[PDB]
Write an enzyme that holds these catalytic residues in place. Structure first.
Site, PDB file in Angstrom:
ATOM      1  N   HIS A 238       0.830  -1.222   0.139  1.00 37.09           N
ATOM      2  CA  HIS A 238      -0.024   0.089  -0.115  1.00 37.09           C
ATOM      3  C   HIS A 238       0.931   1.295  -0.050  1.00 37.09           C
ATOM      4  CE1 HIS A 238      -3.091  -2.908   0.975  1.00 37.09           C
ATOM      5  NE2 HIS A 238      -4.010  -2.145   0.952  1.00 37.09           N
TER       6      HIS A 238
ATOM      7  N   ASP B  27       8.652  -1.618   8.265  1.00 39.18           N
ATOM      8  CA  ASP B  27       8.024  -2.209   6.832  1.00 39.18           C
ATOM      9  C   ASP B  27       7.964  -0.965   6.075  1.00 39.18           C
ATOM     10  OD1 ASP B  27       8.143  -4.808   6.400  1.00 39.18           O
ATOM     11  OD2 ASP B  27       6.494  -4.938   7.974  1.00 39.18           O
TER      12      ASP B  27
ATOM     13  N   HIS C 203       1.343  -3.226   9.580  1.00 31.38           N
ATOM     14  CA  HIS C 203       2.921  -3.277   9.283  1.00 31.38           C
ATOM     15  C   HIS C 203       3.739  -2.754  10.407  1.00 31.38           C
ATOM     16  CE1 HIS C 203       3.044  -5.153   5.343  1.00 31.38           C
ATOM     17  NE2 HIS C 203       1.570  -4.455   5.089  1.00 31.38           N
TER      18      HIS C 203
HETATM   19  C1  LIG Z   1      -2.436  -0.919 -16.519  1.00 27.96           C
HETATM   20  C2  LIG Z   1      -1.783  -1.123 -14.974  1.00 27.96           C
HETATM   21  C3  LIG Z   1      -1.741   0.537 -14.391  1.00 27.96           C
HETATM   22  C4  LIG Z   1      -0.954   0.418 -13.125  1.00 27.96           C
HETATM   23  C5  LIG Z   1      -1.737   1.386 -11.928  1.00 27.96           C
HETATM   24  C6  LIG Z   1      -1.232   1.341 -10.760  1.00 27.96           C
HETATM   25  C7  LIG Z   1      -2.368   1.460  -9.848  1.00 27.96           C
HETATM   26  C8  LIG Z   1      -2.301   0.249  -8.571  1.00 27.96           C
HETATM   27  C9  LIG Z   1      -3.590  -0.537  -8.884  1.00 27.96           C
HETATM   28  C10 LIG Z   1      -3.638  -1.833  -8.214  1.00 27.96           C
HETATM   29  C11 LIG Z   1      -2.353  -2.272  -7.457  1.00 27.96           C
HETATM   30  C12 LIG Z   1      -2.835  -3.833  -6.862  1.00 27.96           C
HETATM   31  C13 LIG Z   1      -1.667  -4.758  -7.090  1.00 27.96           C
HETATM   32  C14 LIG Z   1      -2.311  -6.103  -7.735  1.00 27.96           C
HETATM   33  C15 LIG Z   1      -1.356  -7.259  -7.340  1.00 27.96           C
HETATM   34  C16 LIG Z   1      -1.582  -7.447  -5.823  1.00 27.96           C
HETATM   35  C17 LIG Z   1      -0.371  -7.621  -5.013  1.00 27.96           C
HETATM   36  C18 LIG Z   1      -0.520  -8.099  -3.552  1.00 27.96           C
HETATM   37  O1  LIG Z   1      -1.369  -8.923  -3.289  1.00 27.96           O
HETATM   38  O2  LIG Z   1       0.110  -7.078  -2.558  1.00 27.96           O
HETATM   39  C19 LIG Z   1      -0.899  -6.218  -2.107  1.00 27.96           C
HETATM   40  C20 LIG Z   1      -0.794  -6.144  -0.434  1.00 27.96           C
HETATM   41  O3  LIG Z   1      -1.703  -7.001   0.121  1.00 27.96           O
HETATM   42  C21 LIG Z   1      -0.836  -4.945  -2.586  1.00 27.96           C
HETATM   43  O4  LIG Z   1      -2.197  -4.318  -2.469  1.00 27.96           O
HETATM   44  C22 LIG Z   1      -2.245  -2.942  -3.139  1.00 27.96           C
HETATM   45  O5  LIG Z   1      -1.366  -2.486  -3.562  1.00 27.96           O
HETATM   46  C23 LIG Z   1      -3.155  -2.164  -2.402  1.00 27.96           C
HETATM   47  C24 LIG Z   1      -3.238  -0.765  -3.445  1.00 27.96           C
HETATM   48  C25 LIG Z   1      -4.506  -0.247  -3.747  1.00 27.96           C
HETATM   49  C26 LIG Z   1      -4.907   1.539  -3.849  1.00 27.96           C
HETATM   50  C27 LIG Z   1      -6.163   1.763  -4.429  1.00 27.96           C
HETATM   51  C28 LIG Z   1      -5.961   1.275  -5.720  1.00 27.96           C
HETATM   52  C29 LIG Z   1      -7.498   1.301  -6.688  1.00 27.96           C
HETATM   53  C30 LIG Z   1      -7.517   1.857  -7.700  1.00 27.96           C
HETATM   54  C31 LIG Z   1      -8.866   1.699  -8.649  1.00 27.96           C
HETATM   55  C32 LIG Z   1      -8.990   2.891  -9.793  1.00 27.96           C
HETATM   56  C33 LIG Z   1     -10.677   3.500  -9.811  1.00 27.96           C
HETATM   57  C34 LIG Z   1     -10.478   4.843 -10.286  1.00 27.96           C
HETATM   58  C35 LIG Z   1     -11.137   5.916  -9.384  1.00 27.96           C
HETATM   59  C36 LIG Z   1     -12.152   5.270  -8.403  1.00 27.96           C
HETATM   60  C37 LIG Z   1     -13.471   6.162  -7.977  1.00 27.96           C
END
Ligand SMILES: CCCCCC/C=C/CCCCCCCCCC(=O)O[C@@H](CO)COC(=O)CCCCCCCCCCCCCCC
Ligand SMILES: CCCCCC/C=C/CCCCCCCCCC(=O)O[C@@H](CO)COC(=O)CCCCCCCCCCCCCCC
Ligand SMILES: CCCCCC/C=C/CCCCCCCCCC(=O)O[C@@H](CO)COC(=O)CCCCCCCCCCCCCCC
Ligand SMILES: CCCCCC/C=C/CCCCCCCCCC(=O)O[C@@H](CO)COC(=O)CCCCCCCCCCCCCCC
Ligand SMILES: CCCCCC/C=C/CCCCCCCCCC(=O)O[C@@H](CO)COC(=O)CCCCCCCCCCCCCCC
Ligand SMILES: CCCCCC/C=C/CCCCCCCCCC(=O)O[C@@H](CO)COC(=O)CCCCCCCCCCCCCCC
Lengths: 264, 264, 264, 264, 264, 264
Positions: free
Chosen positions: B158, B205, B201
């Site tokens: 996070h 961390d 955490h």
């Molecule tokens: C095409 C890719 C572009 C990258 C964009 C970067 C943004 C990060 C998004 C998601 C990261 C999640 C990690 C996936 C793998 C899990 C790893 C794990 O299993 O480890 C996790 C720890 O348990 C990591 O979790 C996280 O990273 C939590 C972060 C969430 C923060 C909010 C993100 C919500 C985005 C929604 C967008 C909506 C638009 C507006 C809404 C009104």
């Protein structure tokens, strides 16, 4: 030009000794936090679960450290600008040990089960902790001069000394001696491996200590060679007492060697 | 000059989703090492012992993490070179999340006692670990879309997402908007504080996760602006797949903004 | 010019006997591993299974070495640059025997069945082996002064000495004496043949001993004649103390002859 | 100029495959010498005594071999001079494997006690040896397709193939791709480590098989680049059929890559 | 030149009512803290302990505001740049009331004993409070349209409104009418005096309300007249949407008069 | 030029000390108004409700006060114009503490329930008030030397001294020492935090006491640097006895430091 300033090295040495005493006292205070710290089972590690404990592996690290210290003393004996070299070791050791104190204060990460028979404990007073701090201070923390009776916490200290001495030996020798450099690197790596193989530290402690010492050394030397303490207001260098020591040193320190005694 | 390469961005988006799916599988392998991981007493910490647990604090971290995503999504919509920006976000969220798998494999540091009632466990097979790895993958790891049932290990994730989005918003907005810059820095710090207030955490961390993403961001943009991938054989840049993405981008990306729709 | 350095030769001479003593120290340690060394039947060898064992063949090899030593000693007696020739013999015999310790330490391969009546063994101590090593060191290895009572291991030293002396005999003689070279060559082959016929070593014990001495002898002379030790960073020479000894010698040593004494 | 003589490459490919049949046949002959070859205790080693036997280690050696052959095929397809790279590979493998036949025939060295359950043995005839040799021939000596059931002898063949395919990927790619070059070292070192850990070959058979291929590769390319075969009567090159294969090639082959198929 | 922006004023007008509604929302939340609010005796005040409470004093202040509003409205009716004058009133009344919410939220200080018979209270819900806010918002706060039934807190809005209107009346009139300005000052002081005599606020409630409106009014005009919003990085202005509204206005607004209608 | 008028500094020091006696006397007068002042419940605050009372917190506020005074004395000794820095400090403390008398006299605001055990009270007479006031006068209001036993009123005096001595250390040191400037902020902020945590003063008395001293310091130095007191009839400066004290000073005082004693 390079000015031998013998009244600043004394200040640097005093600063480092004060830092070491503070570190010993902070170690005693931190050990006072948790009573047992020797009943839990250890964290699942990748190197502490494969390689079994080697009882004699912790003295070899200090043997390597003494060898590197002797080589560094020999280098320091036959140099032109030995004052600057002695003034740069101290200003970095103090900073790295201050970082060690900060890291050890926030969270305490020990290894559950070695040194389980260490005596003393429950030092409940203001004037009994100071005797233990004095012992750890004037015992150098080594396991040969028996002080290291109980365990040690995050940001190992042996790795810091080994890496700093190795980097200084490699830096302040002519760039044509690429066998002493290999020997020093081998000694450093073997010392780190023997720290890890005695089950005294976790893998992450050693890795972060190595990284921090290497990065701080490289950054300090880049700033010193770039001479940014008087170039402009670059970043307000955060090294404790940096411009006070390097003000009279302009540019880079060369590698000229002489013999100090007047008896050929 | 800046060439919009819409096929290199697709290769970058695929690269991230493989990395995110690799981390979710490692987090299930690591959880199988020690069965209990919920019976020990926690390490003596300076923040987890002072501030008591706030039950709703962990949900506010993601609320703070969706405002920064929506704000960044607006920057990505009104920009000239939005193809490069999306290709830089993906080339960094994969490298940092690869370092998370390395430090979570060598030693596993969890917090003994929260999420103590999480079900499942003892996933003894090859085809049941994958199903558990799919639930975490297609849930984004968030606590709102319930996936985060058990605890989490070293190098919090996070803090990586909050800090990466904060630095991109500040970097890719005009250097005259120093109120949105201040607002983003508040959401970053408040989001970090609520990870510790929920007792999810340790205090160490969150500091090495904040340091690494900040350091890797500034190092990437130094090389990208100095343009050392074709200047000379400087250091053989270790960023995974760096020169493949930035070959067609020379110099610095400006801050020109437009409107993409052809309907005024 | 070719300056005879009478103080560097003394340093060179000291080097070879230390390696000679160090090799003897390793030999007794290797014998301590397995006690018997006399129960295994001989391995299938295409050479040892044909030629019957000859008890007096081993003494004949030592006779050939003395004859070759006499020829080389006479050449050293009547040479202009006798200091340089003696310095190269010690700088090359100290390197080959260093490789012998590494090969013998990593693995131990002796002749299974010869010298089954050799006494000694079972030295449980840390002071008796030093006296035993002194007997090994101060016997020069020949059976005429009976020291080598038990068997010997891989990469035999009889082939190293016999081959090394032969090449100096041919190298430092004028290119018009192509009759002594034939006499020297036949002596070397005859001495090597007697070692194999004496059932004292395996066939592969001799071949890798014949190749390494010849390869290192030619590599040493090619570097010296090309004098690439100072021309540039040629190959990062790994020869022990190579540039130190050959810094004052440039070009190729001629073959001028004189008389040493001042009474013609 | 560089004219691809496809009638010469075919003669090279058939030449190396005859050596493979010769190598397999002589392996049966040396096996028939000592019947038991499974009763002796192993010779003292420095690596075979500390690291215990790992049953699955020897499978990973061939897995790394397949990957190193898969990348080489990728390099062979996209290279403009694909008829030259293949011809040199066949002319080098035959020479190295011919040396292996010489060292196996002169002396026998195996691990006394592994693969003791292999059946067959006592192939006393003129025709059954060919059938057993043919089975080894059409099995590539691999253990995944189980043919190599009994023990193996000196000059391990898994070290040559793991190293020869490591020095062609590095050599025949542009000198700016030094990450696949770095990657191919891990594929080599781990393949070297696992055969030792599986108690398949002594610690000296691995070292002298890594040295010979490295030496016989660099020596070949130095001769070819400097075109010393026709420049003068340099050294009477001892490579079997060297001047015949490399007579139509002048200078160094460039690193131009092209797609051969006519379907863009 | 002074360009009347008829679309920016609409944006400016929308801003002030949102803040007016937001302040009303905070007011009911503050009243929820302490239920009684009518039990404490008045604190010792040198002004309230002298002047007896007057029931009709509070209604007189609201009468004065209407009279001052009429004078200001007439000025706005017969001004060349009536768009800019109306835009500045909304950009200054929306900032002072923002400071009112922060002061009222951090601490709550009301008059202990007046309006003890006010009804309502104990709104345990999240929807009934909103309907109360519309009653507060859509009553403009005066007691003539009875909305302000209970007491009021620190930083009274009666002083803010009365003082803000007075300064615009004097500022945007020619420097030859120094008789209306005297009349305006009498109304402002008389209205403030009636607030204190009505026992509706403390003495320090009015003083810090009188200072902040005057300080912010003069600071706004000094920046606008100096036009430092674009001249340089003057002070990093913290006024909400200051540069946005005043980017098109340069220099000082004159005092030209005309007739608005087209029928003289 | 800058002529140190030592007869003017003495008149400044006596002027501020009379204000101190005036401030102490009026504190007794306002205390006599409400007898109990220890029965009411505290007003609803945002910081006094979350953080519980820390008994030792209020002692650390005065500890930071002495350190800030100790550094200021060090600055007051080594500065060339030590007769000017002291005169400005005495002319600013009197003005700020005169405002404190005005706000304390107009209205009374204390914390209802702290220091409820203080003795004395009901000092109804003409002469006993002076004795009680004199005790406060010769006690500096400090709690280490216990004089301040009862409660305290609005416009906390610990905030002014902690801030006035923070804006003189920063102002009157060279503009390259921005680490002591950084350090003096931590002393100020922690002194501000601890008085709130000890439940000594409301959350709004601290804020309006930090703002007033910061505003009344910057305004004074802007007036002095631009010498607006004699340049024209600028604003009829309202500082009590301003033109008298700063009539012999022209321009800005430099930052030249000198040692006054004649014992090098
Ligand atoms: C095409 C890719 C572009 C990258 C964009 C970067 C943004 C990060 C998004 C998601 C990261 C999640 C990690 C996936 C793998 C899990 C790893 C794990 O299993 O480890 C996790 C720890 O348990 C990591 O979790 C996280 O990273 C939590 C972060 C969430 C923060 C909010 C993100 C919500 C985005 C929604 C967008 C909506 C638009 C507006 C809404 C009104
Ligand atoms: C004037 C100062 C120059 C600085 C030279 C730097 C060398 C470091 C020396 C000692 C560091 C000890 C730290 C003291 C505070 C304890 C902190 C703690 O309590 O933490 C300890 C962890 O328990 C840290 O201990 C250590 O740092 C162990 C390092 C020992 C490595 C060998 C050093 C032996 C030097 C002997 C020189 C002899 C010359 C040749 C002999 C033949
Ligand atoms: C000034 C310095 C010149 C150096 C001359 C080097 C010549 C080598 C001689 C002897 C090598 C002995 C090595 C010592 C350590 C042994 C290690 C071991 O213990 O390993 C032994 C393996 O069994 C090595 O044994 C041998 O050295 C066999 C070589 C025998 C060849 C004949 C040597 C006889 C020379 C007598 C000269 C007398 C002159 C004329 C007589 C009238
Ligand atoms: C198309 C050209 C590719 C070049 C590859 C050449 C490498 C030779 C491979 C094997 C030689 C085996 C010799 C048979 C008799 C050995 C005597 C003995 O019995 O000696 C054996 C051990 O003593 C030697 O075993 C080995 O040769 C081990 C090497 C295995 C490593 C992988 C080899 C797979 C090659 C398959 C090629 C197909 C390509 C598909 C790509 C995935
Ligand atoms: C678009 C610009 C138009 C110019 C007019 C500006 C005058 C502002 C009027 C009222 C401001 C009230 C603020 C609303 C939210 C209150 C917040 C709260 O809820 O806090 C209240 C606490 O008591 C604040 O109350 C007050 O606003 C007291 C001010 C009363 C002063 C007299 C206002 C009467 C104006 C009538 C105009 C009629 C024209 C002529 C009649 C024939
Ligand atoms: C030349 C050096 C200048 C030093 C600046 C000293 C500033 C005055 C400090 C305190 C004034 C106290 C006034 C008494 C009545 C206050 C009314 C009240 O009773 O109000 C009290 C709280 O309401 C005010 O309490 C305080 O003044 C708190 C300040 C304590 C911080 C430490 C100050 C001690 C420094 C003394 C060092 C002097 C060294 C020798 C001098 C030559």
């Amino acid at each position: 030009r390079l000015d031998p300033e013998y009244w600043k090295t004394i200040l640097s040495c005093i600063y480092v000794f004060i830092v070491f005493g503070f570190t010993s006292f902070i170690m005693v205070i931190v050990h006072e936090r948790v009573p047992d710290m020797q009943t839990y089972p250890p964290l699942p590690d990748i190197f502490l679960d494969s390689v079994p404990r080697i009882p004699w592996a912790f003295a070899m690290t200090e043997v390597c450290g003494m060898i590197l210290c002797y080589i560094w003393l020999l280098v320091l004996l036959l140099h032109k600008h030995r004052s600057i070299l002695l003034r740069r070791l101290c200003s970095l050791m103090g900073t790295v040990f201050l970082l060690r104190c900060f890291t050890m204060f926030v969270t305490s990460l020990s290894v559950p089960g070695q040194h389980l028979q260490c005596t003393g404990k429950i030092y409940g007073s203001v004037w009994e902790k100071l005797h233990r701090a004095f012992a750890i201070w004037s015992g150098f923390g080594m396991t040969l001069t028996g002080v290291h009776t109980c365990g040690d916490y995050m940001f190992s200290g042996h790795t810091v000394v080994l890496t700093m001495l190795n980097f200084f030996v490699t830096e302040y020798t002519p760039r044509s001696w690429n066998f002493l450099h290999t020997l020093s690197w081998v000694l450093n790596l073997f010392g780190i491996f023997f720290i890890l193989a005695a089950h005294e530290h976790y893998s992450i402690d050693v890795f972060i200590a190595f990284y921090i010492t290497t990065r701080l050394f490289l950054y300090y030397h880049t700033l010193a060679n770039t001479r940014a303490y008087q170039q402009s207001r670059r970043a307000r260098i955060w090294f404790p007492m940096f411009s006070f020591f390097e003000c009279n040193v302009n540019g880079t320190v060369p590698n000229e060697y002489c013999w100090p005694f007047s008896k050929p």
